[PDB]
From a paper:
We therefore explored the possibility of using a more stable orthologue as a surrogate and focused our efforts on archeal [name] from [name], a protein that was already structurally characterised and is closely related to human [name]. Here, we describe the complete process of generating robust, [name]-like surrogate systems from this archeal protein via two distinct approaches: by stepwise mutation of the surface of the [name] to humanise the BRC4 binding area (HumRadA series of mutants) and by generating an archeal/human chimera (ChimRAD51) in which all of the BRC4 binding part of [name] is stabilised by parts of [name].
The humanisation series could have ended with HumRadA22, which displays a fully humanised BRC4 binding surface. Nevertheless, we extended the humanisation process further into the oligomerisation groove and “behind” the Ala pocket, in anticipation of the inhibitor design process expanding beyond the core of the FxxA binding site.
Author numbering: 108 to 297, 310 to 349
Write the structure that this text describes.
Amino acid sequence: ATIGRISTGSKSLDKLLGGGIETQAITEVFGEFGSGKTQLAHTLAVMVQLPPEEGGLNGKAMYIDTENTFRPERLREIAQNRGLDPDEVLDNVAYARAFNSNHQMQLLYQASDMMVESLNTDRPYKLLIVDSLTSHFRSEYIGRGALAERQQKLARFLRMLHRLANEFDIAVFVTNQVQANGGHILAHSATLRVYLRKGKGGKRIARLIDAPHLPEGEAVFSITEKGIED
Ligand SMILES: [Cl-]
């Protein structure tokens, strides 16, 4: 299947990403608390629903939340300010709370179920958000004696996400709270990594790092009544 791209709402960020976030891939935004990761996720959940000419993939979204970050009223606001029917937009975002790391992995079976049900419809799933990828793994596997198991369980979760991305031709977008002001996670991955931070004058700065097929660079964007914009 053709690799599809979902607009972020920011022309500059889309340019940095080679046109938008990709289907058949896991995009991982990382950065400090307050860097805009959840705002980007919410905006993508709306943008995916739009036609291609408007930055979407005529799709629906599923949003897995681990730290009570999902805000339906924020989706409604983004939808309304983009000229859409907020009730319709909300109906196209399937919410699931993950209570712990084992449940978080269980929810991928539910995701898979929903994706096959919608597959040959005029509105298939095109986006799975996991906000956040790592929080329950970090809270449940603490200290040296649990580190190996944390890594194995997270690796298994990421493998399952890649399977969903590739089997159902969806974009997977995950968030990760990290403090690395150099903008690099040491651990190697098969995610497309974007480092987010606060910039000057209310803006956010995204830095694309370690992509095989896109050059490293930065883009500036704002958080607004429309979600993310330049
Ligand atoms: Cl990976």
